[PDB]
Design a protein around this nucleic acid. Sequence first.
RNA 1: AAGUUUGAAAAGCACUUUGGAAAGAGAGUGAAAUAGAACCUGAAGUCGUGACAAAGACAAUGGAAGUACCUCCAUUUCAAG
RNA 2: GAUGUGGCCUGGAGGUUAGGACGAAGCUUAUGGCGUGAGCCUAAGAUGGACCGGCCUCUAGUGCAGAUCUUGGUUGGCGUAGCAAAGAUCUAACGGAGAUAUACUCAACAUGCAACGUUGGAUACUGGAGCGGGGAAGGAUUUCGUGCCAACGGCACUCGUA
RNA 3: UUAAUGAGAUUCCCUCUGUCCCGAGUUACUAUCUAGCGAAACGACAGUCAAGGGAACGGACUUGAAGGGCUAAGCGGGGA
RNA 4: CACUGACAGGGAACGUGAGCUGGGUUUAGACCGUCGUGAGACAGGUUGGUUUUACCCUACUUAGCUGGAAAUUGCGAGAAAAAGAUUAUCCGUGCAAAGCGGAGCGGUGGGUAGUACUUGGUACGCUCAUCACC
Lengths: 402, 221, 153
Amino acid sequence: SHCKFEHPRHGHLGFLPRKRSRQIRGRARAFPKDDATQKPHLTSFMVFKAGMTHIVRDVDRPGSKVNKKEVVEPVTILEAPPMVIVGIVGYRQTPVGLKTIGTVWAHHTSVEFRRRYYKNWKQSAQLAFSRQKQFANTKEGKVAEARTLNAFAKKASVIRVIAHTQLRKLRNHRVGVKKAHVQEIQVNGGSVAAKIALAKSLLEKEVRVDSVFQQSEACDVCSVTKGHGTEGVVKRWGVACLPRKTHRGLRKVACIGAWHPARVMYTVARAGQHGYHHRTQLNKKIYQIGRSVAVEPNQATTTYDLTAKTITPMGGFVGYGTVRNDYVMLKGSVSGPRRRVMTLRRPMAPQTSRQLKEKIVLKFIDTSSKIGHGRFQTKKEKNQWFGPLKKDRIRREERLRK
Amino acid sequence: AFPSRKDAFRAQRKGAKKHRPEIIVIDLKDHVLGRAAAVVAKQLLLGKKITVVRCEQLNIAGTEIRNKIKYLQYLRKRKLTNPTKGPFHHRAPSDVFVRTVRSMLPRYTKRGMKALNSLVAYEGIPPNVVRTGGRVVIPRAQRHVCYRSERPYTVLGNMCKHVGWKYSDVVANLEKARVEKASRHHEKQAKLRDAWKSARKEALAKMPKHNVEVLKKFGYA
Amino acid sequence: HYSRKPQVSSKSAKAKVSDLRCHYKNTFETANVINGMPLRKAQQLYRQVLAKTRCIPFKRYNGKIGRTAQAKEWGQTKGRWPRKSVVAMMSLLKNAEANAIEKGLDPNQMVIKHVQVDQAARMRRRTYRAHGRITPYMCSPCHVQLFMSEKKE
RNA sequence: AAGUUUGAAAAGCACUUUGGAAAGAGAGUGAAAUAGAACCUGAAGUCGUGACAAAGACAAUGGAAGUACCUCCAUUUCAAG
RNA sequence: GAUGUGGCCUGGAGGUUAGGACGAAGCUUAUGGCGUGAGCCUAAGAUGGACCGGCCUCUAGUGCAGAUCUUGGUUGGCGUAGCAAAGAUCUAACGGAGAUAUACUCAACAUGCAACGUUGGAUACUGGAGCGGGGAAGGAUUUCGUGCCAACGGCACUCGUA
RNA sequence: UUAAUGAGAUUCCCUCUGUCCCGAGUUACUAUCUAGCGAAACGACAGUCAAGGGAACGGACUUGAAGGGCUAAGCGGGGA
RNA sequence: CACUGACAGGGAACGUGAGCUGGGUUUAGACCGUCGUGAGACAGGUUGGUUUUACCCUACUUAGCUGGAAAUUGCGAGAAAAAGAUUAUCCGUGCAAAGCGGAGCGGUGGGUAGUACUUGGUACGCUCAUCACC
Ligand SMILES: [K+]
Ligand SMILES: [Mg+2]
Ligand SMILES: [Mg+2]
Ligand SMILES: [Mg+2]
Ligand SMILES: [Mg+2]
Ligand SMILES: [Mg+2]
Ligand SMILES: [Mg+2]
Ligand SMILES: [Mg+2]
Ligand SMILES: [Mg+2]
Ligand SMILES: [Mg+2]
Ligand SMILES: [Mg+2]
Ligand SMILES: [Mg+2]
Ligand SMILES: [Mg+2]
Ligand SMILES: [Mg+2]
Ligand SMILES: [Mg+2]
Ligand SMILES: [Mg+2]
Ligand code: NA
Ligand code: NA
């Protein structure tokens, strides 16, 4: 017999299985299509999530009742220290897929890059890349590098560079890790020879986020969601609770199948892992690419708000701390908690709609405290509200006797 | 499969030569799918080692639309309660040929498994096969003797690229480069071939006469 | 009379205990793990199990026990820390060591060569169940025998 | 419910050594201790241990016909045969 | 379903013919041989310790895989389900075999854990319709002191209505 | 027919609310992991599916599809 | 009755009770009508009336360990690979024609002065210093 009343099913079957992700970093499963006409360029970057806040802006959108009016939008702040390029790889097409041809390594590598090959780096012999390092500079090693670069030139169709993060430059106290994160970044544009030339030019050097992304464009984000362990069916899939007088518990699915087929199907909701899944999220607009505070202290000062202040709120980002490097401000939210590393990618979808083409100009950036109900934008404002306090009177009466 | 260090050590200790098993290479271009499969399965059960090349050029009788509809009917078969267990539908032409052969063998028995494991299939002609010797055909399964010319027929690669195979252009480019290389080499060897032909033509004056008479009597002049 | 005989009787020591009031299934696992070990190594392992820095791997009688990281060194994922069996096996090892000393052998060279645990005769108590039923409540003790030999460097 | 049926005879294990003890390892009695006290014989079923044979998922068992390896088994042949 | 069989097997009787401490019955088996078969016979026991085999007649409480069969003993599930009402203990000293129990190397942690009785101190509970003090019915030594810790007090004991 | 009475059977109104829209957060005891102790019920043999025929609703048969081994916590489709 | 673009029809042991609920139906108590001398009956009405067990196998959901191509063995040799006294110099070239080519200058530490990079840590010019390859 058919069901009396109908509704859509609970949950999307294209996100199965709901298992823990294989790794903690976000990795792009595909890169945007290569257009050989353009100039060669990089296509991704790695960043670290540090809290969120909100902004004010005027809207430029003809036909909307919000035209030429001020709106408040929440934003996410992600810290972006420069990456370092250490290698070059190439791929050739086969009837069974893409195959790696070889790898060209840089002549020198960092300790943070080499730490990634150990579990106990401090109490070890620390010999990674020593034989390669001494062999690559003899007569034969130079010949081998020439050979592999010619093989790239002859047979490759895809060129990627190997890059890694700089945790020593990140200088964060709650990110415990000291071994670098490593990823391949594909080079798009130009021909294979031009790609190889660009990749060889930027070897052993560092790359800034502002040389990959521009202020008012959009991006895709690859990252892993927050974990919640073992979860029941009501939270995991959003099924309805049962009436109060139900014997043996209410937070269940009442019927898990018919008599035939004499089986439980893969489409029925069950308890299990929730969270810690990889996700690719589509159209996040960049609102600001901010310089390092050591270089420019007035990070959050706008043209309309002349107050001098940085992007870090009073009392710090809860559980994260101060932002000390270059950073990016994205509209809206991203998957994952504070302190997790994520990947920014150049967009795949068409970028021709009005909302994606709009130019963004900020008017106010909020820097009040995220502990409690913050009501001051700066410490000077708080000091103007409260005059001198008892602690200050004691300080100024015991710092003058000398 | 990468050989193990123990195998390499044993081969060095024995100090033998490079061994190659007895293998037959079949060029499958313009062959009828079912008849070629029927012949190959019987030879595999009789104990041969067989490699087939150019699987994207097999033929099926009928129109491409009719054959594509048959494949889509095959594709819709699926274990409803858990599709990770249901039939697995391979889309490449070499996998299609391998499945056709597997269906004509006692697969569940070990003997059938050995016979099926003795077959290798390729699209195009790969470079590890190109130089191994002359290829063969199956006369009782060729299109120009099997089909009436007026009827339409299908080409397997064309049928497969519309149901999901995604390497047709890669195979086409590889085959183009292959044929150019082989043609240039063949033209370069013409002086050698002609010199040997002339040498055979001229040795008939320097051999003894009574041998030439035997050659003429048996028709080798 | 043991189920196996040492190769050289003059260089071997024996020990045995009967109707020991420890669980047969726990003592089986506790005793089987030291079979090929030198005597000092076995004693160190038992001390570390009492300290809970290493575990006893449960390989046969392990249906639905917990998983632990300390089992990884034995190639397993299940193991426990049974103190009642561990202390009894420590006593048995001390007896075998004394027998070796009295025969005039060096305990720092002994290697355990034979270990065997067996089910002994059971004892009966009772338990009370719903609707006026009475049902058994039994104890399962064990026999243990072992011998060790002098290794020849 | 339950044969007290150890042995011809208690000769029912002195003494040394480890252990809180129960016991263990030696030593001794006896034709025999694998006759050590509820002790003649000591089956089946079930379990431990040592050695060995292999072995995918084909439930296991089973029939027929061979082969590889083993065999504390039987029988027949060794020189004019 | 009927019938036949110098057809097979078990306990006892009348005859006859043999065996056994140089090892009877019983038991064990990759011990072969014989028989279409029921079965019979030999070998080995690094098993046992006193009775017993063949043949012709006679006689019967005379052959088991199953009866929700009877009685005894085992067994997977399984070191699993659980041992969650009556709020709760902590600390030092003394006692005890119940420890501070180690091979090289090693100052101590990372290699003897867990648990107990008594006294002092601390912290809580019962809350006079009381885990207060006396009696009837019912029970009959459970009462007292000194010991002891095999079994019993569904964990434990140096303690006990044992 | 009846005032008073009712842990009797029924309908409406006011008050009220997690009964519901539509679920979220918190506590104590469990479950979960460990030390000690330690059962039962049940138990032909077993245990992946589709179609076919069949005592006309197969785990075992016929023809196809799958299927490396061993495990922890859950769950209530099948084991008529 | 009201909303809506629309309020289509069916199957899955008349899907779905070790998933619930228990209003109806279908025990024992009791009242009414009709029937029966009567005990009692009614496919008539009415009120009140215990909803048991998963710790096994499979299925499903998540969560660990680990062998393996003769799918555990044979020594049973198959590369989407390179081209050559039978695979036994190096680049270039088309499985060409030609053209090259074969103390030094690398890894490490010591001084010495400028630069580049997100600016404490790496490179780079000279200069000895031990190991090096050829
Ligand atoms: K439990
Ligand atoms: Mg967390
Ligand atoms: Mg209820
Ligand atoms: Mg806050
Ligand atoms: Mg459990
Ligand atoms: Mg009870
Ligand atoms: Mg009772
Ligand atoms: Mg006896
Ligand atoms: Mg009878
Ligand atoms: Mg019987
Ligand atoms: Mg409890
Ligand atoms: Mg309680
Ligand atoms: Mg009180
Ligand atoms: Mg007790
Ligand atoms: Mg069920
Ligand atoms: Mg359940
Ligand atoms: Na009788
Ligand atoms: Na009447």
